[PDB]
Amino acid sequence: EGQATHTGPKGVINDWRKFKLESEGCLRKYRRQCMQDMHQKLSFGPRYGFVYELETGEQFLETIEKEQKVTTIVVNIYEDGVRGCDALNSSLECLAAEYPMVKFCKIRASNTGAGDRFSSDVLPTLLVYKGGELISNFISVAEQFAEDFFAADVESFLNEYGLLPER
């Protein structure tokens, strides 16, 4: 990357240049082309489609390390019987199906390798990674929605944190 070329004045300048590199009416076309070029580079092929179950902490760590530097990974830490969990797991299943480019996973707190660190008080804990680093951490996620919540809800929620692709 080095020197800036997409934002601030620097961007206005390069944008004007790239413009002529296509200009040689013409303005509007370029405006649309900039936006098109972008979605394209941010839209990656749909690899997954299911919520994967991790059994051990070594797996957790292995899924976020060896993942492509552009893939967003939503991990759900839960424990059966704990209210919310099931509803969340139902929603994630529908979401994973709708956003194949995003990798969804689930793992029992007991299997994390951090016992007491995850008490049922903060359970339905949703973690979000990308590029190896943690981007979001939602303790007691179920609190973000009504008692009865569904896919469409969790989607609206994650979308307002800028976590989901394609718009």
């Binding site: 004045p9 303005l27 692709p165």
Partner: protein, 340 residues
Amino acid sequence: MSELDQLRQEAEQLKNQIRDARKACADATLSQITNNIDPVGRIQMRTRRTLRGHLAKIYAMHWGTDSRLLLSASQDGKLIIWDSYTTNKVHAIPLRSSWVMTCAYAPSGNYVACGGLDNICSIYNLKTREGNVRVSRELAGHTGYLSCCRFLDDNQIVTSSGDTTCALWDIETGQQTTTFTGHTGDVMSLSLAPDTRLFVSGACDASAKLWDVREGMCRQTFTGHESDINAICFFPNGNAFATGSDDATCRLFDLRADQELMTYSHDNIICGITSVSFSKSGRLLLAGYDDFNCNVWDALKADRAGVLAGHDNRVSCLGVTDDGMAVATGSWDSFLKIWN
């Protein structure tokens, strides 16, 4: 025959002296002292409002002093005054150039400005209502693009340009009252102090200069970055400011010390910084990178306190309200969003 080579050395030796005067007071870093301050919780802001109307990439924006009305200049050659609270457009101004690099809102709310590759700072009166055809004043003078502009009041406005200069204009007459010269590279951004008697600017010569508006001269010159300073922002109490450069780092310079107090950088961060803003109390520093991402830094602990917009590669610009109630972000997909 004449010679400059010597005169080029007195400059380096003097710079050298200044370096030792600085190294003479550099006993400790800020992180050292704050090694006991409790880190802030993880900062996670959420979208409250979505502004729709622009038909192109958003280049710049600026909040109004009421922390409710804001402006956005877009590659669609349009200037829009919004009502964040309702998401309604109050004004809509057609520009001549699609290449607008900056835009400002007078602290009174009466006027608005913007300029770009047209090397002209255009001012619009919102009270006489010039939304359709009128353009109160076209500030001509610079021989380089207008990178940034900020109003001191209704008849005074400072500008920075790619022509290596900064100027204090008299809006009525339209005459370049003062000219601040010194930088050796294109001026990228500038920031006003709270009392409006001083202002700082960053350029492509890798230095930050503190100017005195009333007296028109340069008080001090800051250096530390090895690459261009693309953004700069004054600290709340006016005794310091932040800078962002192509070297992928943020530096907190204090005026009295005449040298940086701390640096914000991470090995994973390889893009240049093009935007910087402080939260109300100054505990938080928001940085905008050229990859359309935004990091929220802890001004005291020099560690990422969070991510704004959740690294979606959709932030082209941003800005915090005077009441510190919210953050606005512009995008390349034509949308603005407000976050709490």
